[PDB]
Structures are given as structure tokens and as C-alpha cells.
Amino acid sequence: QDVVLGLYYMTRDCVNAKGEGMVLTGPKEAERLYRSGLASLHARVKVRIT
Amino acid sequence: ARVTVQDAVEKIGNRFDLVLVAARRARQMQVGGKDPLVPEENDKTTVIALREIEEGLINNQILDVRERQEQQEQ
Amino acid sequence: EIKELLKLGDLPTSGQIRLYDGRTGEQFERPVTVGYMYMLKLNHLVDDKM
Amino acid sequence: KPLVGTGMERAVAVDSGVTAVAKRGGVVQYVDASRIVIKVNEDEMYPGEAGIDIYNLTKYTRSNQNTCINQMPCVSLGEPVERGDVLADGPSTDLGELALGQNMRVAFMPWNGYNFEDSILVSERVVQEDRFTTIHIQELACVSRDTKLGPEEITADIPNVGEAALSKLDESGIVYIGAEVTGGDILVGKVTPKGETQLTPEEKLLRAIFGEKASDVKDSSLRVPNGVSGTVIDVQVFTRDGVEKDKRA
Amino acid sequence: VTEFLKPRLVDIEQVSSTHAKVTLEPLERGFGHTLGNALRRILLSSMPGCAVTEVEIDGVLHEYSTKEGVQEDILEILLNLKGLAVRVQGKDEVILTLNKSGIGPVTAADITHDGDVEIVKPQHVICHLTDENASISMRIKVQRGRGYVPASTRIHSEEDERPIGRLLVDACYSPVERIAYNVEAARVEQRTDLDKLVIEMETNGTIDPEEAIRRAATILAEQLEAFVDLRDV
Amino acid sequence: TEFLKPRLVDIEQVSSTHAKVTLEPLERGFGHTLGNALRRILLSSMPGCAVTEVEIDGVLHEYSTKEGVQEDILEILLNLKGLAVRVQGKDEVILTLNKSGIGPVTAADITHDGDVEIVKPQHVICHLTDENASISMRIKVQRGRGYVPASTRILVDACYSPVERIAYNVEAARVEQRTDLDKLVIEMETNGTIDPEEAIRRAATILAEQLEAFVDLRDVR
Amino acid sequence: REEAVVWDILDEVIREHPVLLNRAPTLHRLGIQAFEPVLIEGKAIQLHPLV
């Protein structure tokens, strides 16, 4: 009811994101998310993964 | 610090005699016979003995050799 | 007859007010139901069990 | 009072029992703690020399399960009071309505894991405001009469006394009203003088060392155990015919 | 980076009696929310304040008993004196007396006005005066200090064994109640990166708002000294 | 009134890319203050010299494939955004690229200047080139802060701070009378251009000279 | 008398010592579990949310 809820909200895909379709590395998404101008939904975007 | 003793489960075939080995090591570490090679960061003597077992420098056979060479030197 | 008493006293009809954060100060998501309910205090507490 | 009410809490509060009900009342002449007098009415009156209905309020008394009973006065000087209503508010019975809970700000948030599986989160404002603060009146009753030895006097200037207890007792017996209790202190003291026993001379040398009273009594004063600490309220020990000296009773 | 844009205090308003709209017109890209989030939490967390610590009442022993000639219990009177707001400038511990007998309510200006005691509220409610006999003599002690300290900490590390009559009050100072702030667009003809921020402070006539914001800036400047001037251990 | 200054260890980690500073002990409710101050003072507004614009010769349209590259025409953009080359004297400079043969693009082959200083030759711009020669491209760098998603045509996001991740952890302290206190542990990662403790010092100077307009009168002793 | 020396000794002992926790109805074998204590203000223990 808390951890499953949080990991369900932060990993749920949805359209019409702020700043859609950015190419970016792994840890830099936390750099972009913490300040401004990025939602957690962020559907259909290809980024770097190791 | 000394969360799981899984490395001694992998090395030593049994884990129930591991408790007797660890107690036999820890009493010799807290009374005397060998200086502690692990520094006392935030731990006691039994945790240092368990960490020395986790590193893989002591088992039942090494403590049997140590007991026989302590009984021989007397 | 509860939404009209909500919107009479300069409150939204949804009863949901956007809250900020106390630890990070950032804006939250979609607005949160806040209010003032009737709460109690039981007999059992720590000074008679510890 | 309950903002989210039912409507039947008025009939519950007027019939709760611990209240100040109104019988042929009127203008209240004087409002005080455990003191309220009512001017006699001219329309509805008794022929028995105009008797005055005065209600003695039971304030700061012990209830069951360590609860303080208080009577908060609600009426003032110079206002007419009809029949049926309440005059003084009891415990959690404010303004004549049953209000045994309070109203604080509720935000429905899972916040920082401090509310796991339907918990409750309390900030520092509730602690600083001292809301939901109750008073536990613990009874420490003792017996000092009718043993198999003889009659007894209250504490008889008991030995094994501490320095805080010597600062607590004014003359003898029960401590002064309003003293502090911390840890193990002598609150209730008693003796037990024997008539025909062995006087135990082995502790007699202890009588030469420590103790104001003779140590042959071997008394056990009811001290306060661990977990209880606070302030006393009143002394209402005993009433019987042929009243003795009774320095504190 | 030549950061020369510094915030200055300007045109602090006052609407009814308590909250003062302190405005900061020079801001930066994203430092407004940062400065507000730091300033509100530092101001509400730690700031010096003075209030009632204990009261010695002549004519009574403990706090659970009652007093004749009033319409209010002694414990409720201590809880109402807990919310009493007053400021002091000379010293820290000030003992104040209060003596008036009659018929009617009493005020906060009833006590003796001294050079260190500046009473700001005229309409504070204490226990009333019912009829012809109420000998109220309270020795109210106001102590300058810091955030919320309970009575058990005051008893701890203090061996005095006080006489019966000295009633301890929980140190609920509460100098600032609420702080509301937001970010608004700044003056035109700039680089289109300036903002401005307004801060309302419920300082209730005790501590000046400019003194409060300079104290908050002083604490935030002094708590950052494990930084650049660094040493090796 | 009175406060406390901590005297313990400050920096014990690997000085290449890891950073774990410790701040014990503090006051109740102040690890979040320093954390939220340093995060928004070092993350959003911090000067740098990263790559702003990349102009490759050929197709001036979307995703630019089949113009001298084989595996991806977009991974080289991420490799240039990952590269940070500091500029000391000038403000904006444009670098070129020269590559011959089949193999990964060596960062040491880029023609540098007196102010152009590469942080590491091991940065690979492009990996798979199935051609005997390569096509040069203009790489313009700037000194602008404010890492924003770029919407300016004629293209990649100009990075402001050399760090990549910032977080903080609050831990209780073991002071004698005060128990519930703050032990601030700042876990922040740096790509490897400038050492992280000097970046923390730069954020400290931002917080220091940001507040010099309020500590004028009276003087802070 | 709660001098600072026994507070330091208490901090030294509590930091490295196993402490068992269990329930008064214990119908599983998972009820008795050892953990490590921390000095926390108040007089109520907390239970770990994965327990």
C-alpha cells in the first residue's frame, strides 16, 4: 500500500509529458527531474540504459 | 558489519558446527592468544572473530591445529 | 448540500487544496483532500505498559 | 464542540449525569469554582420561605481508571437561567454538548513512510499547545488500623526518612499539599506498635545509630513506586466519633 | 559568473496589526523558492524568544486546586498566560507582579509597566474579578531563550528543590505562527529572468520583522562555516 | 543563542568520481536546510563550459542518418554532451573533428588550443565508422548556466553543472543530551572534470555572497 | 544520576549488540528475531516495515 503504490506511480507511462522525447543518459534524468520541467510519467522515450 | 555468514556457509560445509567454531574462536580472541587483525571500528571481539571467519582465515581445522599447538607448547 | 457549504466559504467544491512540501518545499501533484475531523484518544498508552 | 455532529448529543449531554442541571433557576448571583448561587424567582416560587438552590460542583476529583473530574463554570453574574439547561460544563461536556474529542487539521498523505498501515502523524504544534492532555489521579490508599497488635497513630514521626521527605513534612505525618514526587519518596507513612512480642534487641544498636523513632517497631511506610510521579491534591483520610489530635486530618 | 544581483529589503507594509509584507524585488533564475524554503524553516525552527516560564502565586499551594472570587481555574489561567506575548530588551529573566481587586475583567496592561517590559496587547483575557474579594498576586517570570524546551529538561541539571507554590509553565513561545510566500513577476525592461517574493510574518508585536529576517539571515550565514575555510583532521 | 561547531572527519572517499561527505553533529531540523540549499545552489544554477551546439555537415533535417556514420547518428550527440572541456580565457570557441580509418574516435585527436583542455582522451565520440575517412563537424561551446531542454533551432542541451546526481541523507546523532539531531550525508556524483569538494565550496560561496546584502548591519562576529 | 560517561558507555554498548524481539502470541517460528538497537527519544520502540 505504500512502496508498491510509489513504484506504481513513478513507473506508470502516460502521454503529454513536459519536454517530450529527450535523449539523455542514466543518472542525468535525476538531474533533470529534481529542478523543474519534467514529469515522472514520460512515455515512449528512448534513453541510455546499461 | 557481520550481517550474514553466507561465505562460511559456502566454505564450511555445515553451519551448525560453525556456531561452535565461532564461539571457540571468540573466547580465544577475548581472553588471549592472538592479536586482533581487524581494527575495532564499532565492533566487539565476537564480531571481529565472525568477520575473520567471513574473510576465510579460520575454520574447524585451523582452530584444531591452534588448540593442538597451544596444548603442545605447555 | 455539502458542496454548497464548501463553495460558500471560499473553498473549492472538490474539497481538495494543493499542498506544498515541508522537507523539500516543492509543489505536489493533483490536489489533496484536507479538512478538520473529530478525533479521540484511547486509554492504552506507553506509560502504563513500559 | 463537534463540527461534524449528530443532533442527539444534546439529549446525551443533558442526561449524562455529571452536569449542573437547572431547577426553578433564574439570575445567577455569584459564579465561583464549586460555588454558584441563584436568585429566587418570583413567578415560579415555593411557599417554604423562598429556598435557594445552590449546586456544589465536584471539581478535580478522582474517577475510575485514573481520570480527573472537573466542573467548568459556564454562566456569569447577572443572566437569567431557565429550566432544563446546564449551568456548569463537566469533563468534555463543553457548552452543554458532549465533546469528548477534538478537531485538528487532517491531510490525507502517505508522507515519508511515517504513516505505514493506517498510523497517525502528530507534529510539534499539538505538543506545544498541550491538546489531548489529561490528568491521571492515582489512588494510594493504605490501612493503619485494627491489626493484631493494637491501636496506631498516624506515622508517629517514622524513621528511615529522607532529606526531601524532611523538606516535605511540615510537622508530622502526611506531607504538605503540593509537594513533588520523584522516584522513591515517602508519601504515606505508618507504624505498627506491638503489645506482646519480642522487642528484637539485635537492631537496638541501629536504634542508637539511625532513626528518630525507636527502631523496635519495624514499620514499612508506603512509598511511591517506580512509574508514578506528580503532585497531590487533597487530604480526606477519615471521619469518626471521638476525634483525636490529628495534626493533618 | 559575476553574480552582482543582490536582494534588498524594500517597502515593508503593515495591514492590520501583525503581519508585515516584506518584499524582495531583486531575485535570480531559481533562487526565490530556495531562499523562501530556507528562510521559513530556519525562522520557524530556531530563533530567540521570551515568554512565561514559571509563576509564583501568593495564596495557593499547587496548580490543581482552585481560587475563590474568579471564574477561571488556576491551571486554565496558567495555560492562558502561556499564550501571553511580551517582549524584553534589557535582560533575560524578568519577574513581574500583578495586583488588582474589584469587579470586572482584567487586562494585560494591568501589570507594572517597566523600562524592560513593553506590553503590546491591551485585550488579553486572564481570570475575572467576581464580587468584592479576589486577592490575586502572581509573580510571572519571563525568560529570554530559544525553541521549545519541556519542564522535565528544566528540572534536569538544576538541583534547587523549589518551595511549594512555584508553578512551572511549559515553554510555548511561538513567535511566528504562519509564513505565506509566493513568486511574482518582477519589473519590466530587464533580462527577463528577475522575480520577486513577498513574505508575511505573524510576529504579533513582539519581534520586529526586519530584525527577524536579519536574524534568519544571520543564522543561515553562521551555520555554513564547516565549508570553504576548511581544515584537516 | 549558543550553537555547536562539528569537529570530525570531512572527506574520506575515492577522489576520482565518488563523493560522500559527513556532517556530524548539527541541530534538530537543519540537515534538510543545508541539503535543500546546496541542491538548488549547485544543481540548477552553476556555471560550466559544456557543449552547446553541434553542426554536422550534410543533412540539416531530422536524425541525420547515412551521412558518414553507421550504427547511430544520435549516440555521438550523447557522447559530446558527456564531454566537458573547460574554457579559461575566451567565452565561446568552436572545435573541429578529424578522423581517419575504422575504429573509435579518440578524444586526443581533436585539435586543441591554449584555452581548450580535454579532461580525458578516453572519451569515445563515435565507435563504428565503416569508411576510410570521416566528415568534420563544428562543436561550439559556451559558458552559460541554466540547464534547460533546448528549443532553439540552427541543438543539444547545453549542460551547466558537471555533476550528474545529487541526494542527501539525514541521520540521528549521538550527542549526550540532544538525541534527535542531523547527520548530513551528501551523496553526489561528478563526471570527473572538477573535484567535488571544490564544487561544494563553489555552492558554499554562492550561498555566502548571495546573503551579503542582509548581514551588513549589524556585523556578524 | 545520568552523567555523560554512562551515556557514552550506553552508546558504545547499544551500537553493537543483538536484541531479540517477539510477540506474546507466537504461533510462527518467525516471531523471535534479533536486531540492533538505537537510542531514540521517547519510550516506544519502532518495528521495521519489512518485519
Task: Give a verbal description of the structure.
The structure is cut from a larger assembly and holds 2 copies of chain A, 1 copy of chain B (74 residues), 2 copies of chain C and 2 copies of chain E. Chain A is an all-alpha fold and 50 residues long. Chain A has helices at 3-9, 28-35. Chain A is globular and about 35 Å long. Chain C is α+β, with helices and mostly antiparallel strands and 50 residues long. Chain C has 1 helix and 2 strands. In chain C, strands 1-2 form a two-stranded antiparallel sheet. Chain C is flat. The termini of chain C are far apart. With 233 residues, chain E is of the alpha+beta class. Chain E has helices spanning 32-45, 74-82, 151-155, 209-222; strands at 9-10, 22-24, 49-57, 87-88, 93-96, 117-118, 138-145, 166-168, 179-185, 195-201. Chain E has a 4-stranded antiparallel β-sheet, with helices on one face. A 4-stranded antiparallel β-sheet of chain E has the order 5-7-3-8, covered by helices on one side. In chain E, helix 1 crosses helix 4. The two termini of chain E are 33 Å apart. The relative contact order of chain E is 0.24. The chains are: A mainly alpha (50), B mainly alpha (74), C alpha+beta (50), E alpha+beta (233). Chains in contact: A-D, A-F, B-G, C-D, C-E, C-G, D-E, E-F, F-G. The E-F interface holds E 1, 3, 6-9, 28-31, 33-35, 37-38, 41-42, 45-46, 48, 145-146, 213-214, 217-218, 220-228, 230, 233 and F 1, 3, 5-10, 23, 26-30, 32-34, 36-37, 40-41, 44-45, 47, 145-146, 200-201, 204-215, 220.
